[PDB]
Amino acid sequence: MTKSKLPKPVQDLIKMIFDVESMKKAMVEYEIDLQKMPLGKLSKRQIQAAYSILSEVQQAVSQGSSDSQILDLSNRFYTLIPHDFGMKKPPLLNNADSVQAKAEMLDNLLDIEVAYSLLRGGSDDSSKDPIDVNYEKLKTDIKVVDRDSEEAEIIRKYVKNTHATTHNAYDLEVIDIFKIEREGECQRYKPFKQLHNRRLLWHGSRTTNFAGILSQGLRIAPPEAPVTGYMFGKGIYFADMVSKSANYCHTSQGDPIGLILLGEVALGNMYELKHASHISKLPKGKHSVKGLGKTTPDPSANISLDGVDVPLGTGISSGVNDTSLLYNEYIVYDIAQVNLKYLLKLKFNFKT
Numbered sequence: 003m004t005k006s007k008l009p010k011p012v013q014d015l016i017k018m019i020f021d022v023e024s025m026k027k028a029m030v031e032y033e034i035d036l037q038k039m040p041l042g043k044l045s046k047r048q049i050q051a052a053y054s055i056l057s058e059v060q061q062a063v064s065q066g067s068s069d070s071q072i073l074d075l076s077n078r079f080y081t082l083i084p085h086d087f088g089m090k091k092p093p094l095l096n097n098a099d100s101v102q103a104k105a106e107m108l109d110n111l112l113d114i115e116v117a118y119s120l121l122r123g124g125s126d127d128s129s130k131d132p133i134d135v136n137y138e139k140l141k142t143d144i145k146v147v148d149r150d151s152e153e154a155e156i157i158r159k160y161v162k163n164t165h166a167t168t169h170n171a172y173d174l175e176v177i178d179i180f181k182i183e184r185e186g187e188c189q190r191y192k193p194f195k196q197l198h199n200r201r202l203l204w205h206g207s208r209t210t211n212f213a214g215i216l217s218q219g220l221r222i223a224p225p226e227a228p229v230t231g232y233m234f235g236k237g238i239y240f241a242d243m244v245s246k247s248a249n250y251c252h253t254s255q256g257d258p259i260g261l262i263l264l265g266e267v268a269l270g271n272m273y274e275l276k277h278a279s280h281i282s283k284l285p286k287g288k289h290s291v292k293g294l295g296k297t298t299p300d301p302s303a304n305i306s307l308d309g310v311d312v313p314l315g316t317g318i319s320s321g322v323n324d325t326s327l328l329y330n331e332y333i334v335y336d337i338a339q340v341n342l343k344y345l346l347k348l349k350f351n352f353k354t
């Protein structure tokens with residue numbers, strides 16, 4: 003029963019990541035029936051089967067098949083994943099929007115099952131602090147960045163400048179800044195180290211998903227996932243506006259604490275797009291996809307950190323007239339193209 007000697011901000015981060023209740027709330031927010039399907043009953047092969055049904059809906063809508071088939075698959079989805087809408091009609095998976103919503107839901111369900119499997123596995127010893135046991139389950143070095151260092155100065159300027167005016171529901175306060183080093187990730191990222199056009203970008207996600215993000219990195223949606231459920235196909239999505247990525251933390255007024263990622267991304271040749279392009283492979287010679295947004299952080303204020311460009315400029319007009327994106331988007335389709343550097347802990351102070 004040796005109390006953990008880890009830094010207090012790290013211990014708080016471990017407790018917040020490995021909280022079983024936060025997993026249960028996240029499933030309740032999706033209106034999943036926890037009585038007919040509790041958290042311990044979540045299965046990876048069950049989520050993959052739900053991914054396949056979403057893919058069956060995608061192909062039926064395209065091939066002009068029976069919309070009656072699209073009704074049977076919708077009811078199949080709700081039998082596979084038991085929900086509880088009370089007295090309301092469940093949303094019908096009959097169009098592309100419904101597929102994207104349930105695709106995003108299964109991405110968080112797959113990460114929740116990963117966090118719970120990580121928690122209830124391995125070995126156990128009641129002589130060690132549970133905080134110490136969970137920290138080594140992540141297989142990640144986690145150090146607190148000093149508040150007065152130039153790293154924290156640049157990171158704060160990154161959060162300070164790239165908060166979009168459209169995302170007016172809140173403003174962000176940086177609580178903690180962690181310098182993370184995933185086990186073995188640096189060797190995996192080595193072939194992309196001297197690739198040109200490397201940037202430090204944001205990645206937001208649910209807090210419960212970070213037990214798997216630190217354990218296995220940022221993954222691509224499984225093969226069973228429908229490629230049309232994501233705007234630019236099955237890849238890893240990043241942004242340069244801190245508010246665009248913080249929206250994917252799914253932070254509520256009840257739980258206003260968020261976790262966001264700062265990662266070095268080997269972009270290389272950017273396939274610049276303006277609208278949806280559901281692809282799994284890039285054209286030969288390209289290494290990433292950039293969704294051109296109307297507003298881009300000023301390129302004149304670009305600075306470097308460890309040889310990595312940091313687009314912390316104020317948002318100005320990009321010079322792109324016809325685009326379906328308000329802000330930029332960076333997508334890679336190889337997991338080795340990501341090197342996670344920092345992990346931030348943000349307080350969401352919702353306004354107006």
Ligand SMILES: Cc1cnc2c(C(N)=O)cnn2c1
Pocket residue numbers: 204205206207232233239240241246247248250331
């Ligand atoms: C479809 C999609 C998913 N995730 C993201 C992020 C992020 N997680 O930071 C930014 N844009 N984006 C887009």
